[PDB]
Amino acid sequence: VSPPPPIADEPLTVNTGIYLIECYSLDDKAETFKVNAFLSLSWKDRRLAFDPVRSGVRVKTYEPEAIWIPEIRFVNVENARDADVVDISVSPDGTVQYLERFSARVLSPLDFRRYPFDSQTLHIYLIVRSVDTRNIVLAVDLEKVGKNDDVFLTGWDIESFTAVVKPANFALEDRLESKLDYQLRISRQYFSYIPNIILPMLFILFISWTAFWSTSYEANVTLVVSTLIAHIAFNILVETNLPKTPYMTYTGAIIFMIYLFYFVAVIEVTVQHYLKVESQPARAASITRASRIAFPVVFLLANIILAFLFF
Amino acid sequence: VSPPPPIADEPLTVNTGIYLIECYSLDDKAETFKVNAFLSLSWKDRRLAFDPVRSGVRVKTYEPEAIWIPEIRFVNVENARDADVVDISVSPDGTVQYLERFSARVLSPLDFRRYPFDSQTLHIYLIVRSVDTRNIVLAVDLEKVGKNDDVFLTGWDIESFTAVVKPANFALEDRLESKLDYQLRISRQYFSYIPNIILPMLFILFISWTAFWSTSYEANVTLVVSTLIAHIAFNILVETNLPKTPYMTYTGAIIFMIYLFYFVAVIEVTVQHYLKVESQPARAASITRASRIAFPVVFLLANIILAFLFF
């Protein structure tokens, strides 16, 4: 088997169509997602053309090994795609209609800067290395690009599945390569984050600040320290569901900033006691009384500043 | 090999049948379950007709590669099917009796709204893409649809295994497709949740309320804060056995509501001390005396309201 010769030198255009059957297993840490889909290919192989009058049949079916098929590969994949050829159909002019069912663990990086309120653009890259005889260019047949209505990605909202119609044609090891970009747009389902991490993390912080209505140093040490240990658990629980980013994340910023509120709360609690012992509970009172307004106002403003910077 | 030609203008009806051998590994987080089953197929291929007087035998056995077999695929599956052909048997009229033993990790979404008192409807979808020559329609032979009596799903009760007899016939990429729905109904075994999660969580919550019979602010802070940190452990332990749902769950609601009871108890405990110090233990007494009745009554009513809304 050899590639179809050009009538004229014009390169072979392979019409590509992807149709997602099932979407699943999005790993934030590994920045991977698994997909179950149909891959449709179409090209002109005049060597396979036939007269529909004499041949009787208007369509001819073939086995993969029987005819020439372009080596279309996936760029960003981990597992060896579960390729199962479903159909090969030749028209009278020699237009091959290929369709295979595949599945692969795709490697698309994620941007966690606005996590868990982040949105992503997942990619599926199709590629074709041009052969010695003639060059191969990829094309998108938008008619065969889509996704099924049942398609769901657990804890995410599937917005779009589109294809960057103009392929990125480039040179590699002295040979032409045509790369295509299939983009799956998803937004995160941040609902479960609010009652499981955000609000409990806030309740522990507000419980910590009850130390500004207490004069008991012994009880204040308990109140601020306990809640701090409970904040360490929450910061750890969070960093385990995320990869080690070289940037600060929205949840990451808030969590880190809260460590400072605990640190300053411990300073206030210490000062109050030192002053009490130093027989000047008058200053101790005015510091504590200020902290009562300061801590919530600075926390409310700090969070506005963060949300402003992040969104 | 080519499909069996139609005497008439009718489509080929492929009679399906599934018989679950072993059911196992239901992953709540991934919304997957694994299954070990028999897949039985039957169609009429008149090209395979024989005379048992000449052929000698009354039934003829074949290898999968030897004869035409319809490309029946599973829609919602992760791993490639562990397909092992057990039997292919042709009758003199040309009725092929196919039977394969398979196993697959099926992707069926779960509804956790009433968890752990939830019930599910797991699905197995069979599909067949119609070929160029003639269309293919799926059918259910209820005689070969079932499950073995030993079939057990750890921590679940297997109610039914039925098949939506009318196949969903639809168009896809200019071709006819016949989809079938096999439904496995299961109810959760919530027994182990009561002494491991629910009762221990109520014990720690009731322990926290002993602070309504204590005047020791220092001991109260220990009681109310310690139990709250134990409650945080349960909230984390629970959310690890579940996926991040865009809705509130029954256990999720209760556990979140309990965070407010800890928050208000911390307020009461603070108030009591502030008033004690402010030399008015008279008001402090009446607040604590109310909180003794209030906390259990509001918790009892709140839970009735939740259970009402969820069931």
Next chain:
Amino acid sequence: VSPPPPIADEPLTVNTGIYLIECYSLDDKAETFKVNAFLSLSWKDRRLAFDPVRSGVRVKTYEPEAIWIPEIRFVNVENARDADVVDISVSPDGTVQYLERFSARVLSPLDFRRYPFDSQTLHIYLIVRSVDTRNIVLAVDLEKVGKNDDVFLTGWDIESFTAVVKPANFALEDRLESKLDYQLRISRQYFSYIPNIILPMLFILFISWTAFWSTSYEANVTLVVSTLIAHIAFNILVETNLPKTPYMTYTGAIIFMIYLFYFVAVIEVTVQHYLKVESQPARAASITRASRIAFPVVFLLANIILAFLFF
């Protein structure tokens, strides 16, 4: 290839031999165990018979594809058995001696009611679906059933490996099926449970009870609350090494009952302080003094009752 025709009506008896080479990876949560073993099969195929004086050789070797071999399958297996044919040997009368080396992750349910002092009966089920021409019945050749002396199952004691000699012959999808039961009896190695989970758990309970010799409410709260949280931590460590059973387990019973001892301890500790504050330390004294004897006696009796009910 076709099955061996019967001299008479009688079904073909296939002699089954199962022999364990290596036993490993028993998963309590998944109720699975992996096995490395030899599967020996023997049947009479008169079509393969030969004269030993004329053929010279007394025994003739064959390739699996060359001769007819009965489709013997495993019922309770997860991943397709790693079948490697070791030997096929035909005798002069036509007695085929088959031997394959396999490995599989077997699905046998476990009874955790007496955990970690439980014993199990693991099963390996062989099955054969009867063909159109003649029925197939399984048989146990006890001479080729066993296990190697090195065979060890980590954290378990291997008692027996026997076979239920009478096969369960039954109808399924209009065809005869002969099922065989290979039983591997194992008892748990509960030694490591005593100094790692049982004894540390009792020390924290007895430490909790030192509050019956303390009048310091603040120290008692710190005492009983600390140890309650350590017991929560053990209840969690235990439930992670076990599946969610719809029944109570021996360790499960004890651990749940202990929560009540902690709950009543907290009540006692509260009562003592309430009475102390109420200026009647006389009753407070008699309550703690009773609790001193009551708590250990009721715990000792309760455990006798549990052990009685469970064994």
Next chain:
Amino acid sequence: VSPPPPIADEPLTVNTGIYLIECYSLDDKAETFKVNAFLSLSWKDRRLAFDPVRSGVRVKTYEPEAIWIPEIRFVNVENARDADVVDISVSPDGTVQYLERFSARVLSPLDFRRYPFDSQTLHIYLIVRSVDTRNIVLAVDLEKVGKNDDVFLTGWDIESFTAVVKPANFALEDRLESKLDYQLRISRQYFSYIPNIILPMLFILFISWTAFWSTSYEANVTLVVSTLIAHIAFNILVETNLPKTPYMTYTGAIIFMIYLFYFVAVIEVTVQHYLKVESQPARAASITRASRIAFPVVFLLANIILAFLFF
């Protein structure tokens, strides 16, 4: 293909030799290790002999399927060997020189009695089942047995890789079997255990006892109970990196013995307070003054006794 006939009765001697390329993934819990190695085999097949004069070539290369190769299998392996034939070379007299590159997850039990100061002897067992025509005996060609200098096992020191030259010849299912033993000796790298588990543990114990110089009952509690819990988190961390042994381990012994020091230190702390309250701080003083010498002397002696018994 059939085995090489004997000139005489003599059994066929197959000369083995393993050469470890890469050693890795030693799982203590599963008692498995993975290996990447060369397997070299050599036997005399006179049917393959040739004259080096007329043939021209002094060596002839063959494909595995072309010539008879002895069924050499691994006994203690989990996943089917990644066998890749590298070379088959026949000499003029008919001496076949076989070499394959393999990789397997090997199952060799481990002895944790002296953990983490333990040493192991990992095994790789080669086996050959004798055929109907003639018996097969294994042999070690020490010239082709070894390991590469780069070979490293993470967290272990590779001492030796030797072979038990005399094969264990025995009967199994009426047939002769020749088993060979390849032994890989390794010693554990216990360095990381000292600053991460041993030393941090000794400190929470020394802190646990600063409660022998304090008369404050509350502080002692927190100080010895505190302190104690930290050692419950340390106990769980060690038992998660180890399987459930039916014997006591060195680290296991030490950790368990500390649970008694913590228990007796809580008794001492209770006694001191009871006596203080009972208005006899004179006895309370003499008990605590003794504790301060007793606890460290008994701990120092106890550890000597343990180390003596374990090494």
Next chain:
Amino acid sequence: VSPPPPIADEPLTVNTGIYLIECYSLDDKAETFKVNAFLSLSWKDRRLAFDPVRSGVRVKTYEPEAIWIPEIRFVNVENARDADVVDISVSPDGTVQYLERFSARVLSPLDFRRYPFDSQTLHIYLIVRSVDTRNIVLAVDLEKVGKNDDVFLTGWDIESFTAVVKPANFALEDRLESKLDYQLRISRQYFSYIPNIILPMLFILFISWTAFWSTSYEANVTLVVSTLIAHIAFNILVETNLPKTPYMTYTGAIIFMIYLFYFVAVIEVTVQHYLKVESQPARAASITRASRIAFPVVFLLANIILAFLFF
């Protein structure tokens, strides 16, 4: 198929080239990384030479099975090569241009001494075993060695991908072997370590030091102990993301040293109380006052010494 005969004595030079497509999954514990790449090979097989005048074509394409291909293998790999031949192209003089697309989990050891500020040199070793007829030597064609611009390794910075051009030629089991070294240089992205582990760990240590401004032994025990438990949680969280090194790491050093600061702070806190009780709060004051300056100065100096020794 047989190797290409030498014109002369000279050995066959195989020109290698690796091109990383996708780099991913770097496991610190397992010291492995996964790679998706192109492997290009080139050698002179004069048996395949042809005249470009009469043959018409410039280049001739071949199937892997049709022509002789050198057995190039990877040394340090865990996963079987996902070899997919993309192109085989013969020039008129007989220069074969081979190109395959592969993927493998590579085993390259990591040096954690400067962790998380460490840099690594990952290796990919190509090897070729010389055949009976003629020896094979590897060579680097630097033109086909590289990496794509999109290539990203999560939490790492990819510096270089170079090849040690001179192959390590050595003897093994009486045969010549040519080994090549492909080096991938990476530096760690330590950003996320600073607000998630380093800074929190320091806030808790400084919180512990507020006990040098407190006279409340009861409150001091809560402080130095609660913060010690937090420091255990951080040592645990850290040692779980790392393998058990036989050396001290930078983070490991700091963490261990901080234990001593907690231990000495507990001694100080004890001394202060003992002296207070011993009715000499004068010495207790001077110890506490020194400790105020001592602890931060000694910690600041100790860290300078560590950083000096480690970098």
